[PDB]
Structure formats: C-alpha cells, structure tokens
Symmetry: C5
Subunit: 329 residues, 5 copies
C-alpha cells in the first residue's frame, strides 16, 4: 500500500529547504521513585509525535486514518528526540515493541512510544525535613538544529495529561506545567528544548514520631535528677550519663541516612541543642557535689542550685521550642 | 507449505473493514515476590492467543493442527498485547525463544509465549500487620482501538488456571478471578482491557514472637520495682531507666523496615502505649523519694503510692489489651 | 558440503508422520549458590542432544564425524528444550557462542551448549539448622507434544556426570540421580519431562559457636547471683537485668537472617527456653528481698530460697539439654 | 545522494599510504559518582570526530554542510576510539541511537556520540579526610598504530568544554585540562593517547560534626571524675568505664566505611590518642583507691593525685590538638 | 581485496586433514576485585591469536601486514576459545567492538580482543587472616579436539605480560606464570588447556588495629578489679560483667563478615581464649565474696586469692601470646 521501495529515507522531508515542524504531546503514567543520596527521579510516560511526509501518501475514498503493524518504523524516516541530562532510559518490548504508527492518505503521520527515564535533580536540604523541591524533564533533538527542525508543543498548555493513579508515599505532588527555551552548543549550533515541570512537598509525620519525640523525652528524663536527694550519688550520676549516651545514638541514627552535605540541616540544630541541654545537667550535679564537700571540710535540705535548676531548665527548653517552630513553621 | 512470500503482513486481517476478534487464556506458573517499600509484585505465566487468518491456509486430507518451528513468527502478522501499569518484563530465551505456533488448514492460529512481569500495587498499612491486600494484572492492545481489534476471554470464567505449586512464605493467597472493562485515552481512543484479580492475607506469628512479646516483657519487668524496699535507691532507679532505654530500641527496630507513610499503623499504637506505661513507673519512684525526704525534713513500712501501684498498673495494662484485641481481632 | 539451501527447515524431520526421538545427556560443572530468603539455587552445566535428519547427509569414504563452525545452527532445524519452573537463565557467549555441532555422513547429529540456570526449590525449616533439603531441575520441550517428539535419557542412569571440583562451604552434597515423568496442560496436551535430583545437608559448627554457646554462657552467668550476699542489693539486681537484656539481643540477631515463616524453628525453642530460665532468676531475688523486709518489720545467714536455687536451676537446665539433643540428635 | 554502493568501506582512507589525521573535541555533561571502596568514578560526555574522505563527496551549489539520518554510520568507514583502563561504558539509545553525522560536498565529515564511562582512579588516604585527589580519562585507537592513524586535539587547549551544572555534594572540582602522550605495546606497536585531567577536594564539615566533636566530648566527660569525692567508689568507677566503652564504638563506626588499607589514616591518629587519654583516667582512680586503702591499713581531703590531674590532663589534650592541627592544617 | 565471496568459511583450514596449530599470548590490564563470600575474582585482559589460512592471501609488492576494519571478522573463520570454570564475561563495545584484525599477503592472520572475566577460586581460611591464596585462569577450545586443533603458548614463558599499574588495596600480588595440561570429557574427547597462575598475600595491619588490640585492652581492663577493695561490691561486680558483655560484641562483629565455614579460623582462637580469660575474673570475685561471708558467719586486708591473681592472670596471658605468635608467626 505504502510505496516504501521508491524513496531514500536517509533524508528528511524538505531536505535542502526550510525546516520541518514537529509537534509533541505527552501523558505521564507514573512517578516511580526518588533518591536524595543520588539526587534523581524516575518517570514512565507515553510520548507522541506529529508531522507530514508526502512520500507516505496513498489513495482511498474514505479520507480516514489507518494503523500499520509497526515493523515499518525502521524503514521510513522518523524524528530523533532524546532526554537531556538523563542517567538512563529504555523502551518497553513485551510482548513486542510498544510502538504505534498511524498514517492519513495525504501523508500526515502519528507516532507513539512508551518509555521509562531516570533524570538528574539538584536538591537543597537546608530546611530538611520541612523542605520543598522542584523538578523538570528536558526534551530535545539530537542531530538537527532549528534551521532544519522546529519543535513545539502541539496543543499549547493542553499538551500534558496525568494519570489519576499517580502517588508517592512520602511526598505531595503538585503544579505540573510545560515551558520552552532555546539552547546553544559551541561546536554545533542552536536547538529548541521543551520542559515538563513539577513540585514536591514532604510529609513530616514520620520524622516527628521517629526523631523529634524521643529527643524531647531524653531531655525530660534528665530533669528528674533535680528531684532526688543530693546524697544518693550512685543514683544521680548514672541517670545523667545514660541520657547523654542515648542522645548520641539518636544523633548518629539520623545522619546515617542522608548525603554528606557541607552545610547544617534543620534537624541537626534541634538534636545538637538537645544534646547540650542534657550535657549541662551533669556539670550541675558535679558542682553540687563539690560544694557540699567544701561545706563538709569547713564543718569538720535542698541546695540553691537544685532549687533554681528545677525552674530554669524547663523554661529555657520551652523558649527554644517556641523560637524553633516560629522559624521553621 | 505456508505461502509466506505472497502477502503483505504489515496489514491486519480484514484491514479496511470490521474488527478482528482475538481470544485469550492464561495459566499462572508462579507468584515470585512482593515489596512493601516499592509497592509491587512479580509474576510468571503462560499467555495464549487465538484468531483466524485465511492467508495462512494450506491443503491436507486430515483436517488436523500442525506445529511449526517458531522462526516464522517474525514473518506473519501477530497481535500486540502489553501489560498496563507495569514496571518491567521479559520473554524467556533459553535454549531458544519460549514461543509456540500452531496452524489449522483453514487458517485458524494458536500462539503461545512464557513471560515474567513486575507490576504496580497500591497498599494500605493502617492495620499492619493484621492487614489484607488486593491486587490485579492488566492486559491491553497497544496500537489498535475497539474499532479494529476486539479482545475477550476465550472461555469465560474458565480462562484462568493456576499451578498447584504456588506459595508464599508470608501470605495466604486466595480469590483468583477475571474481569473486563473499557478504557479511554484522550489523544487516541477507546480500548478493551482484561483483568486478573487476587487477594493476600498476612501471617501474624512472626510479629507476635518478634515484637509483641518482648514489649510486654519489658512492661512486666518495670512492675518488679514496686516490690523492692524504697530505701534501695541505686537499685530502683536503674531498673526503670534500663527498661525505658530498651523499649526505645524495640520501637526503632520495627519502623526501620517499612515505608515512611504519613499515618499511624496498628503496631505503632501498641508500642507507644507500652512506652508510656514504662515511662510512668520512673516518675512514680521519683515522687516516693521526694515525699520521703519531706517526711525526713519534718521529723528532723510501705508507702501508699507503692501499695496502690501494685494493683493499678497491671489492671490498666490488661484493660488496654482487651480493648486492643477487640478492635483489631 | 551440507545442502542447506535445498530444504524447508521450518518443519521437523518426519513432519506429518510419527514422532522424532531425541536423546539427552548432561555434565554438571558447578552448583553456584543457594538462598533461603528466595528459596532457589543456581547451577551451571553442559547439555547435549542426539537425533538423525537425512536432509543433512553428505558423501565421504571415511564414515567419520565432522565438526562445523557453529553459525549453521541458525539455518537448520534444532530441538526446543526449556527449563521448567526456572527464574532466569542464559547461554555463554565469550569469545563466541559456546555451541558445538557435529554431523555424520548418514545425517546423525550431535548438538551441545553451556548454560547457567536459577531454579525454584521449596524448603522446610522446622528442624533448622539441623535440616536436610532435596532439590531437582526439570527439562521439557516447549512446542511439541509426545505425539511429535519423544524425549529420553540417552544412556539410562549413566547419562549424568559431575565435576570433581563441586563444593559448597555450608552444605554436604549427595545423592545425584535422574528420573522421568509425563505432564499434562489443559489447553495444549501431554509432554515428557526429565528430572535431575540431589540432596543437601547443612554443617552445624557455625551455629554451635555463634548461637548455642553464648546463650548457655548467659544462663550460667545468671546462676552466680545465688552465691552473693542477699544484702548487696545494687549488685544482685543489675547482674540479673543485664543478662535478660543480652539474651534479647541474641534472640534478635538470629531471626533477622531468615525468611518470616509461620511456624517455630528448632533454634527458636532453645533460645526462648533460655530466656525464661534467665527471667525467673530476677523474680527469685525479688521474692527474697520482700521476705527479708517482712522479717525486718516483724523484728522491729542464707535464705532457704537461695539454698534451694543453687541446686534446682542447674539440674533443670541439664535435664532440658538432655531432652533437646535427644529429640534433634 | 551519497554513493555508498560504489566502494569498499572495509579499508580506511589512504589505505596503503600515509596516515590519516583525525581530530577530537569534547564537552563534559556530568560527573556522576565516586567510590573509595572501588577506587573509580563515572562520567557522561559528548565526543566528536573530524576527518576527510573523498569517497563521500557530492555535488551542490551552496557549499554548505548537510545532516543525514544516522543509519548510514554502519555502512561507511568510521574511526575506532576506546577508553583505556575503563571498567564499563555504553552509548545511549532512547528514543534512537544518540548519534549524529554531517558531511560537506568535498567529503569533510563530522561525527558525534553521547556516552557514559566508569574509569579507574588510584587514591591515597594518608591525610583522610583532609585529602586531595587527581584523576584522568584516557582515549586511544584500538586497531591502528601511529603509522596509519594520527590522533590530536582539534583546537589545542580550547578542545574541552564543561557544563555549568556540574556538581558533587562532597567535593570541590577544579583544574580541568588536556594532555597527550605516546604509548607502546610489545606485541603490536606505538599509539597516540589523549588525556583529560582534573582535581578534587573534600569538604570536612561532615567529619567535624560526625567524628571529631563526639570524641572530644567523651574526653571532656572523663575529666569530671577528678571533681568527685574519692569515697564514692560506685560512682567514679562506672563514669570512667562507660566512656572507654563508648570511645570503642566511635572508633568502630568510622573505619567500617572505608577500604582496608595497609597504613594509618589521619583520623585514626586522633581517635586512638583520645582512647588512651580516656583509658588513663581509669588507672588514675585505681591508684587513688589503692593508696587510700594502704593509708587505712597504716592507721588501723583531696588526694595529691586528684589535685594534679585536674591541671595536667586538660593541658596535655590542648597541646595535642595544637600539634595535630598544625600538622594537618 | 580479500576474496571473501569465494569460499565456505563454515569449514576450518585443513578440514578433513591434520590439525591446525593456533598460538596464543596475553597481556593483563587489571585485577579488579576478590570475594571471600563468593570465592571468585575478576580480571580484564587483552587476548591474541595467530594462525595461517591461504584463502585470505592477496598480492602486493611490499610483503607487509595490513589492518582491516573489523566488520570482516563475522565473515571469515575464527578460533573458538572459552574460559573454563568461569561465572560470567563480556567483550567491550564502546565506541565499537574492541576487536582487531591484521593479515599478511601469504595468509598469516593476527586477531585480538579485549575482555573481562569473573572466575572460580577455592579458598582456605584456616590461617585467616594470616593466609596465602593461589589462583588460576583456564583457556580452552569449545568445539575442536586435539585431532583438529592444536593450542599452544606462542613464545613459551615470554607469552604473558602484566601492566605496571596493577594493584589491590588488601593483597600483595606475586608469582605470575603459565602452564599447560590435557583434559578429557567422557562424551566428546581430549582437549588442550592453558593456565595462568598467580599468588596473593594478605596485609594484616587492618586486623591488628581493628580486632586484636581491643580484645587485649578488654582483658587488661578486667585485671584492674584485683586492685580494688573487696568491700566495694557494687563497683567490682559491674566492672567484670561489662567486659564480658563487650567481648561478646567483638566476637560477633568479626564473624559477621566471612563465609560460614565448617572449621575454626586463627582469629576465632584468639578471641575465644580472651573470652574465657575475662569470664574467669568474675568467678574469682564471686569466690572472694562467698569466703568473706563465711568468715563473717564464723566471727559472729587483702585476701590470698586477690594477692595471687595479681600475679597469675597476666603471666598466663603473656605465655598464651608467646605460643600463639610462635605458631602463626
Ligand atoms: C472528519 C473529516 O475531517 N472529514 C472530512 C470531510 O468532512 C470532507 O468532506 C472530506 C473532503 O475530502 O475530507 C474529510
Ligand atoms: C505556569 C505556566 O507556564 N503557564 C503557562 C504560561 O506560560 C502562560 O502565562 C499561560 C497563559 O496565560 O499559559 C500557561
Ligand atoms: C476433530 C474434528 O473436528 N474433526 C472433523 C471431522 O469430524 C469432520 O468430519 C471433518 C470434515 O471436514 O472436519 C474435521
Ligand atoms: C467474581 C467474578 O467476577 N465472577 C464472575 C462474575 O462476574 C459473574 O457473576 C459469574 C456468573 O455468575 O461469572 C464469574
Ligand atoms: C567406527 C565404526 O563404526 N566404523 C565402521 C566400520 O567398522 C564399517 O566397516 C563401516 C561400513 O560402512 O562403517 C563404519
Ligand atoms: C534412584 C533411582 O532413580 N535409580 C534408578 C532406578 O529408577 C532403578 O531402580 C535403577 C535400576 O535398578 O536404575 C537407577
Ligand atoms: C562559509 C564559507 O566558507 N563559504 C565559502 C565561500 O566564501 C566561497 O566563496 C566558496 C567558494 O567555493 O566556498 C564556500
Ligand atoms: C596545564 C596544561 O597542560 N596547560 C597546557 C600547557 O601544556 C601549555 O603550557 C599551555 C601553553 O602555554 O597550553 C595549555
Ligand atoms: C621484514 C621481512 O621479513 N622482510 C622480508 C624481506 O627481507 C625479504 O627480502 C622478502 C622476500 O619476499 O620478504 C619479506
Ligand atoms: C614456574 C614455571 O612454570 N616455569 C616454567 C617451567 O615449567 C620451566 O621449568 C621453565 C624452564 O626452565 O620455564 C618456565
Ligand atoms: C569537664 C570539666 C568539668 C569541671 C567541673 C568543675 C565544677 C566546679 C564547681 C565549682
Ligand atoms: C520530668 C519532670 C519530673 C518531675 C517529677 C516531680 C515529682 C514531684 C512529686 C511531688
Ligand atoms: C512482674 C510482677 C513481679 C511480682 C513479684 C512478687 C514477689 C512476691 C514475693 C512473695
Ligand atoms: C591493668 C593493670 C592495672 C594495675 C593498676 C595498679 C595500680 C597501682 C597503684 C600503686
Ligand atoms: C556458674 C556457677 C558459679 C558458682 C560459683 C561458686 C563459688 C564457690 C566458691 C567456694
Ligand atoms: C516535640 C515535637 C513537637 C512537634 C511540634 C510540631 C508542630 C507542627
Ligand atoms: C538560619 C539559622 C536559624 C537558626 C535559628 C535558631 C533557632 C533557635
Ligand atoms: C502479648 C501478645 C498477645 C497476643 C494475643 C494475640 C491474640 C490472637
Ligand atoms: C482507629 C483508632 C483506634 C484506636 C483504638 C485504641 C485502642 C486502645
Ligand atoms: C551448649 C551447646 C551444646 C551443643 C551440643 C551438640 C551435640 C552434638
Ligand atoms: C515437636 C515439638 C518438640 C518440642 C520438644 C521440646 C524439648 C524440650
Ligand atoms: C574538636 C574539633 C576541632 C576542629 C578544629 C578544626 C580547625 C579547622
Ligand atoms: C607523619 C606522622 C604525623 C604524626 C603527628 C602526630 C601529631 C601529634
Ligand atoms: C596484641 C596484638 C599483638 C600483635 C603482635 C603482632 C606480631 C607481628
Ligand atoms: C592447629 C591448632 C593450633 C592451636 C594452637 C593453640 C595456641 C595456644
Ligand atoms: N543536541 C545535542 C548535541 O548538540 C550534542 C553535541 O553533539 O554537541
Ligand atoms: N493503548 C495505549 C496507548 O493508547 C498509549 C498511547 O499512545 O496513548
Ligand atoms: N510445554 C509447555 C507449554 O505447554 C506451555 C503452554 O503453552 O501451555
Ligand atoms: N591499542 C590497544 C591494543 O594494542 C591492545 C592489544 O591488542 O595489545
Ligand atoms: N570443550 C568443552 C566441551 O567438551 C563441553 C562438552 O560439550 O562436553
Ligand atoms: C545557620 C546556623 C544555625 C546554628 C544554630 C546553632
Ligand atoms: C511547643 C510546641 C508548639 C509548636 C507550635 C508550632
Ligand atoms: C487513630 C489514632 C489512634 C491513636 C491511639 C493512641
Ligand atoms: C490478653 C490477650 C487476650 C486477647 C484475646 C484475643
Ligand atoms: C512444636 C511446639 C514446641 C514448643 C516448645 C516450647
Ligand atoms: C549436654 C550436652 C550433651 C548432648 C549430647 C548430644
Ligand atoms: C605515621 C605514624 C603516626 C603515629 C602517631 C601515633
Ligand atoms: C584547639 C583548636 C584550634 C585549631 C585551629 C586550627
Ligand atoms: C585446631 C583446634 C585449636 C583449638 C584451640 C582452642
Ligand atoms: C607479645 C607479642 C610478641 C609477639 C612477637 C611476634
Ligand atoms: Cl551503688
Ligand atoms: Cl550501677
């Protein structure tokens, strides 16, 4: 039906003349995973192309579109899109190549394929884990400059659809939209580039329950010492030491999961402030013990330091929490 | 025998006319693995197709079906099924492609292949680990709409068989069955979709023995303090502190295995209630020590608080367990 | 030499007539790994096929066998064996495909290839780690029923050889042998199936030294308490608590390595019995302390409980060990 | 257009005569990851080739360059570059091969491709983590010696461009530049080799906060003992022991992450010196207890050892830190 | 130039007559990694072949060798070497297949390729980590017996070269050399086999510092108890218990890294002897406490046991170390 043997498909339509326009639209099937250690995400989508080539015209009386097997895609000419700044990708091939080709009697062509991509995304963790991130996926032609191929969104802002099933267990997904920009390479020229943009927001419940509550409970345990007879030395000393030693484990367990950045995160501040709060309660009792021994040496109830600590330590911690949650909201 | 050189197999049977019907049936060989962190499962199965094409007719006197090598599959026309919402898949190829082709003298065709698939499954962990999940595998044609191809289960509900060897170490598998539904894509049209459905139920014995028993034993250890002379301060203080510090480790060891969901699970409730039960026994003795020191200061047996705690703490824990196992059964 | 252009190799020898017999023999090169979490093993072997096809006859005066390059395998007809219930496999291809083809002047053919397979194996862990497992590898034709192809072991029981280098660090390997059985699929018919069977036995030394000895040592540490003055409360209390808290870690470290089965293993019994032995020694001293305080209240040496515990606890543990190693031998 | 059927492209241009010159230039897209355990890095780049072949001449009036599909690359002759000392690499192929071919009417050719490489890099950890590393990527022709192919940087030092987005979370990247050298293989001859060089510098903030601070805090905790009444034996003994036991965990947690080198690293020195500082404070109190018991035996305030330790231990640690940070800056 | 269309390259040179000799030589580029858990190593090398075939003769006046593209390798005949007892391998293919072909006017051929291999190696850990291992890589023809192909090292012992960059962070590499042996398969015949042999020696510094020193320090901590007043029960009891409990962690941390062998390693002996040394110091004080209580009961300084332990325990440990390092050197 299609006159495939007649023509040299190594050359584009309009070869030697003005640029060929090619339109694009997209449907996202899933957003698959995200990594902070590697700074990347994975996405699966359907991608579609539109153009006209009169070498693929055929006669009919119905003026309708026809579908063809799919093994003809490797005989005709086809555009050459690639994903910019991507780590890896593939096209699906079970039970056969997931490819579709439809042609109109005047030579208009529709071409579609299903693909999975993993792409680069630079992340900022200064407000972690109360953070927000923004991402994009880039599309461009490899071989043809804007003097030979013209690339655009087919229907404007309506060119992007999203599956209603899309979900991530740790993030809220929002603000899908599309943009365009021109790009330059020194050795080869100017190119059109298409963008798909979106925003992510992290859920905090896991981190409350797994980090912020136990640190608070250790701080509250250290306060119990102020309520115990100053004469019970082998009770008051280990009570403080054990809380110091636990707070160290919590600090280690948090930071072992993240990338080794060169700046402080919002969770680090909270944990290290709680550490100094616990550390100071040990020096307090050391002072009380020394001053009591001096009194014994002079001579040979509740001490004022205990009496004041019972008020001062909790008030200070409450002030710190008010400030912190005013800053990070 | 088969006139393969005579015809253009880029076009379907009945091209330009009414839709071709294609029937399907399936046998599941194994259900291979399941992930909560990734929310997916893996399955291996045999998949079969049935249709008629008169371009593949041949003469004989016996009216019987014949089997052909398998290298002819890439010369003739073949339907184009794909698995919807799937992460990855392949066809087996040792010692050769695991493919079968049988043809009748009137052009009826039987086509079979062996495949492994990994597929998406959304999971709810609010009753974990006493939870039940339901899953499905989706089948659809990539290129042809319901105006060109008609897809149906060959024998109705009898179209699905299951291997007697199928098993999972952590789940009971039940309720295999098949359904159909129509699907719409904005840019390309209407399609028939086939479903395979099943249900999973988790075994709880591992979690009893590995989580619920040790937390109970820590709670029962904290009660021993009420039976010890109030004068033995360096004994009664560490006995409580060490149980608090162990309960924290159990809490951490559980949640380090699961996805970071934004809601509380049924096991979290039990562990955090046990934590507060243990935490309170430390404040109890702090109160007894303070009140004894006040009595000493005034002046200068078993305390009522101990006497009452010996009854109140165990009764409250038993009430809590009755309620909990009434709710989660 | 071979008349390859003359014939249609899409059709088997004797197409349209009685079944073709095909003989098989095997040499195992290595048994590569085993997984309890995944319930599978990996094997590498050489696999050989024997049949006659008169379309491959050629003239000679010597009546001897000749070897051919190997690129002819994709032109002639070849049998279609696959491994049943397998997870994955491949054929080796460095520096070229590891394939061999030899032909006799009357058309007798010998065909060989090297392959690696990973296969399913259901395992029972009720006597773990003193357990024994049995495994098998299954071989069958994909497309041809017993009416068209007949599959058998070439030399009877002599058809299976094993490399003298085969070894596993954790198991003793024994009892290699071969069997045959007929198989039925509802939609497609009856098939011949060949089996390779073997047995595995686990070495226990690692588990003695890494699990059973330290649990025993914790139990023996708990007994030291009975030998210490009942007046040293802050010594006798932590001595018991610390052993409870260590035994919990041993229990956790064992079960974190295995699949989450729904039944008790032989190592679980030992560890949980040792746990209760240690748990009881804490209640013992609690009783002694309470009864001493009652005597003080009445009034205002070694206690009989200590005196009896010094005999009763070790005797009971020794009785338990005699029974256990009588049952699991 | 191009006379591809006319010529034998198994032979290079100028076959049997002087060497063909081939020029190269490069743009780096990303530096992807680095491993100390494996001693390697990963890089993604665009690579370009320039040469003339008169068998690819064609007539035109415009004297301009033309772009061709890309399926012609496997028909014509093309240079054979490989990456020396590399572990693995691939060329990107979605949605098609990422390859470009441009030709001028006189037969000048431009050839480009996108690739990812993982390459060997020998590392020195004697000043870890205050260390600096230098790396390079090597390029060479596989089959042709300098008598048949001549390989050079196209534009001198201007032949290397770098993407402005390039970043690593743990390193500062600096000093990109290019060099050339001749290489010899005994069996096959002399070859031209091109180099791409760069330098890396590690950020230290993570290691301060995660290793050096907690070790210092343990040392400062051990000093508190000198301020406590020498009569409180069950307080002063555990205070020292627990710090020894914590310092061991820090030492283990650091070295579990790195390769098992045969020499001491700069972080090892700090940690083991802090260990001996803590170890000595236990022997100190042992001495005080023994000497006090001797005084009791003779007979039957603050001891001079405590009085002097309160000054000597901190001064010594401060001297050690001054020296250390003078050496490692 | 080469008459490729004239001949049947499915047949070897001298087909039907005496065996063809094929010579080999090798250059090792890198030794990439080693695993004790899997018992294997990985190697990358260049491999070369030499033979004569008069079907590849061509006329010239210069009598020199010529290089050809590399796409002709799949048209001519080529030998069929494979690596015996190997787990996996591949040939490098970026930017093209890393293959070289050179031919002389009389039909002498040189063939080269670059490859990476992973190979089996049986290891003995009875003297671990002071152990020495020996390894080899095996080379053989798949399809042709010694009656049809003759395989030998081209230049004798000079056939093996090694890159000066080769290094491993944990081993000293020594004693590279080559051997030959004949091999028999029951079903198929006799074959020539080539060997590459080498030796490895482990560096011990990591294990000194990470295992042997801390165990010694725990033993020395247990001795401090003998220097403390026998009346300080809550000090002397935990001092011993905590060292027992730490030594258990060291024992576990070592053996969690290695394969689960059925025999004792040299490091196990040291650690378990140190364990009993620490265990005995607890029974010592238990005895002293009991005997003191008996003296109190009779009645109603330093004990001889302490006095003797202060000499006996260290002397015994020093004797043990002398013997151990005399045996394992
Ligand atoms: C759906 C559609 O666009 N149909 C048109 C039809 O209305 C028109 O009469 C014909 C003329 O060729 O072209 C086609
Ligand atoms: C967020 C975004 O890119 N929105 C685009 C925007 O460029 C434009 O303003 C709008 C028309 O009003 O169409 C849409
Ligand atoms: C198994 C089967 O269906 N056999 C039928 C046979 O009964 C019938 O006589 C024949 C007529 O062509 O067609 C075939
Ligand atoms: C569970 C399920 O899908 N069962 C199907 C159902 O649709 C139908 O009701 C039944 C006929 O009674 O056939 C079967
Ligand atoms: C090894 C073997 O079987 N050789 C036989 C030979 O003994 C016999 O004389 C000949 C007749 O064609 O066939 C061949
Ligand atoms: C273990 C096993 O399968 N052995 C087979 C068996 O079937 C048969 O009894 C024997 C002949 O005596 O040949 C062999
Ligand atoms: C951009 C460029 O180099 N253009 C030149 C043009 O200036 C010159 O007149 C012509 C002669 O053939 O060759 C071409
Ligand atoms: C760092 C480096 O390689 N720089 C090169 C160098 O070889 C040369 O000195 C310079 C010219 O001044 O060109 C550039
Ligand atoms: C390098 C070498 O071997 N060159 C020889 C040359 O000496 C000899 O004169 C010629 C005769 O054909 O063969 C060639
Ligand atoms: C270690 C080794 O294999 N060395 C070989 C050896 O077989 C032989 O003794 C020597 C000649 O003296 O050549 C070399
Ligand atoms: C880490 C040094 C701690 C010193 C404590 C001094 C207390 C003095 C009380 C007057
Ligand atoms: C965490 C603060 C604990 C305060 C305990 C107060 C006890 C008062 C007893 C009357
Ligand atoms: C967990 C509850 C423990 C109760 C101990 C009671 C001892 C009574 C001795 C007569
Ligand atoms: C590890 C041996 C410790 C010995 C301490 C001796 C102290 C003597 C004080 C005079
Ligand atoms: C594990 C049993 C320990 C028994 C200690 C007995 C000491 C007796 C001293 C005479
Ligand atoms: C102690 C944790 C407090 C968490 C407050 C969160 C406010 C949104
Ligand atoms: C940008 C630094 C914020 C630090 C705030 C500290 C709140 C107590
Ligand atoms: C302490 C755990 C109790 C578990 C009860 C389970 C009831 C089915
Ligand atoms: C849906 C919340 C259930 C909480 C029940 C608490 C049982 C003590
Ligand atoms: C305490 C462990 C005893 C192990 C006995 C094993 C008997 C074969
Ligand atoms: C099948 C259960 C065996 C339990 C034996 C217990 C031995 C003390
Ligand atoms: C206690 C850590 C001190 C770190 C000093 C770093 C100086 C650049
Ligand atoms: C090259 C060894 C440096 C050691 C310096 C020690 C500083 C206290
Ligand atoms: C305490 C460890 C001693 C190590 C001695 C090593 C002798 C080569
Ligand atoms: C082969 C056993 C060696 C054991 C030596 C023990 C040294 C104290
Ligand atoms: N469109 C991408 C190309 O320009 C990359 C390159 O070859 O420089
Ligand atoms: N049947 C799936 C296709 O419609 C996907 C698409 O190209 O939109
Ligand atoms: N021999 C295996 C086949 O029968 C599988 C199937 O297609 O049912
Ligand atoms: N240019 C690399 C080649 O020389 C490798 C080899 O075959 O020796
Ligand atoms: N040279 C290896 C072959 O003999 C393997 C086999 O087919 O037996
Ligand atoms: C940005 C610095 C914050 C530090 C608070 C301790
Ligand atoms: C004390 C916690 C209050 C924080 C409110 C955001
Ligand atoms: C759904 C909330 C339950 C919380 C019980 C503490
Ligand atoms: C106290 C446990 C009983 C729960 C019964 C389901
Ligand atoms: C099979 C049950 C055994 C349980 C022993 C405690
Ligand atoms: C007490 C251990 C003896 C067990 C013998 C099998
Ligand atoms: C290079 C040796 C340094 C050791 C310092 C303790
Ligand atoms: C005591 C820390 C000072 C180090 C300055 C580099
Ligand atoms: C080979 C046995 C050695 C055991 C030493 C305790
Ligand atoms: C006490 C350690 C000496 C060992 C010498 C090899
Ligand atoms: Cl005490
Ligand atoms: Cl204590």
């Amino acid at each position: 039906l299609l006159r495939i043997d007649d023509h040299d498909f190594s050359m584009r339509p309009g070869f030697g003349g003005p640029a060929i326009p090619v339109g694009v639209d997209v449907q996202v099937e899933s957003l698959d995973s995200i990594s902070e250690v590697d700074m990347d995400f994975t996405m699966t989508l359907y991608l579609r192309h539109y153009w006209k080539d009169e070498r693929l015209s055929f006669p009919s009386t119905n003026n309708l579109s026809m579908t063809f097997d799919g093994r003809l895609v490797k005989k005709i000419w086809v555009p050459d899109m690639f994903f910019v700044h991507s780590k890896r990708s593939f096209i699906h091939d079970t039970t056969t190549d997931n490819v579709m080709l439809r042609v109109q009697p005047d030579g208009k062509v529709l071409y579609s394929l299903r693909v999975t991509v993993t792409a680069m995304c630079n992340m900022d963790f200064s407000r972690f884990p109360l953070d927000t991130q923004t991402c994009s996926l880039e599309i461009e032609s490899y071989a043809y400059t804007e003097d030979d191929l013209m690339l655009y969104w087919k229907k404007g802002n309506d060119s992007l659809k999203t599956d209603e099933r899309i979900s991530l267990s740790q993030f809220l997904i929002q603000e899908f939209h599309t943009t365009t920009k021109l790009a330059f390479y020194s050795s080869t020229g100017w190119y059109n580039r298409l963008y798909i943009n979106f925003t992510l927001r992290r859920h905090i419940f896991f981190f409350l329950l797994q980090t912020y509550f136990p640190a608070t409970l250790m701080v509250m345990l250290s306060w119990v010492s102020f309520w115990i007879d100053r004469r019970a030395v082998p009770a008051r000393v280990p009570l403080g030491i054990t809380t110091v030693l636990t707070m160290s484990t919590i600090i280690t367990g948090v930071n072992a999961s993240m990338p080794r950045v060169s700046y402080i995160k919002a969770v680090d501040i909270y944990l290290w402030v709680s550490f100094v709060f616990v550390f100071l309660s040990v020096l307090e009792y050391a002072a009380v013990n020394y001053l009591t021994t001096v009194q014994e040496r002079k001579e040979q109830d509740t001490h004022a330091i205990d009496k004041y600590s019972r008020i001062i330590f909790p008030a200070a911690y409450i002030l710190f929490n008010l400030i912190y949650w005013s800053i990070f909201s």
